[PDB]
Amino acid sequence: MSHGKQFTLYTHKGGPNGWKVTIVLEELGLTYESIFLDFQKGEHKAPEYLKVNPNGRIPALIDHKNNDYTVWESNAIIQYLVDKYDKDRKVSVAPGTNEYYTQLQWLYFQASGQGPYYGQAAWFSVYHPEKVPSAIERYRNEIKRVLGVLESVLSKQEFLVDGKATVADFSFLPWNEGAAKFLLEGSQFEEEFPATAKWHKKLLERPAIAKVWEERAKVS
Amino acid sequence: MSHGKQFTLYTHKGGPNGWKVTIVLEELGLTYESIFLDFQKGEHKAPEYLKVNPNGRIPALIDHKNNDYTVWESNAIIQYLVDKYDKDRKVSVAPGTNEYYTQLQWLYFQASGQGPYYGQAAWFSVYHPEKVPSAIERYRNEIKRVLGVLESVLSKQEFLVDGKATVADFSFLPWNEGAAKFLLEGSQFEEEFPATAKWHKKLLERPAIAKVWEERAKVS
């Protein structure tokens, strides 16, 4: 491609799910061009992009070193990336093992248990055209539930897929940061979910991830 | 195990996500004992089950032919099952191929784009302690959007992962059936999403799936 990096990444300056992918890209030392879409201008619903993802959401990924193979859904992308490009197993477990499917389990918990429900909280709190306290409450409570699920595990073992930091852990970061900052009361995160918070903060301190967060902060 | 089948499946008579797994089990000709949990009696939140899934939801899977390896999240289970036990690739594509990650993409779209949002529709329509038309509307519309995404693809190609029915296709069945019957206006499904509906109805006509649906109907 013209930008000359291995990957095109369709993403967004603010939402968590593009940064979710970016984290793994950086961890794997891969090169990528971030294409930031403007939702306000409906760029995610435009014909050109719908070609890339007919869901018209971000993120999506094009691998210019693989016959411009294109894939979307953040955790699908992430699976592609570690499987193909983490053969040394820095931040992932091997395909074709029991552990792989525990890894996958946690990725699915992330993509279907954390993201969607956190996002409903996001929506109703700020962006819903009327305030609905019952709806707000519902999804506030679910955030707490999900966090409690994580706490129940992380208090007993260091990482989700026991033994080592993996993408399974990384995948939770952007949504959990959102919640820590704007969906929960300040200090509720540290107080109520001490294990999870430690696990989260330490991960953000990985050099690669810290790098990405810096960039995140910049396009704030 | 005492029930003497290869798998234990923790599931529920009514919800879609247990039947989602059951479909694949039957397609693969595997043996399993279905353990139906009673939500009304909080059996999904009880200590014994939380051991199996600390998320305290169904489904979850124990493979008594694999050192009672246990895994949860419907599409994680499903990935385990086809990867390990579909080596002949009846209803799945091979690990370590480009197609695998398009398969995975669609599974993630199912688990995070269809299930959660359909479920919010389910919740607000019937079970939310107050009626909120804006919330109802939101998730009704999202059902339509998701269906429109499927229609945009399925009108152009026979199956999601082009060439052959796969678990990617199967995974959509239970939620889409729910919507067809109770979340949309009758005949809205056939009229507004003609490609998707055909794809859905034909799948339900696969011998294995039709079998499962019969059983579904029985525990109605």
Ligand SMILES: N[C@@H](CCC(=O)N[C@@H](CSSC[C@H](NC(=O)CC[C@H](N)C(=O)O)C(=O)NCC(=O)O)C(=O)NCC(=O)O)C(=O)O
């Ligand atoms: N499952 C997908 C989620 C993709 C996704 O949500 N991407 C967002 C950017 S992160 S922004 C987070 C996002 N919120 C939104 O997108 C808010 C707008 C939306 N139309 C709505 O009405 O809810 C959300 O809650 N997602 C749930 C989740 O993460 O599982 C997007 O493109 N939004 C444009 C749009 O949809 O209009 C993935 O992980 O890749």
Ligand SMILES: N[C@@H](CCC(=O)N[C@@H](CSSC[C@H](NC(=O)CC[C@H](N)C(=O)O)C(=O)NCC(=O)O)C(=O)NCC(=O)O)C(=O)O
């Ligand atoms: N992502 C998981 C979803 C697991 C799931 O939702 N299982 C349901 C049975 S299907 S029933 C469908 C389910 N609804 C519910 O579970 C309704 C009760 C819930 N506590 C609530 O307040 O929403 C739903 O909407 N799910 C969203 C989705 O499919 O992605 C369950 O155990 N419910 C008990 C409970 O949570 O209390 C998977 O695919 O395995």
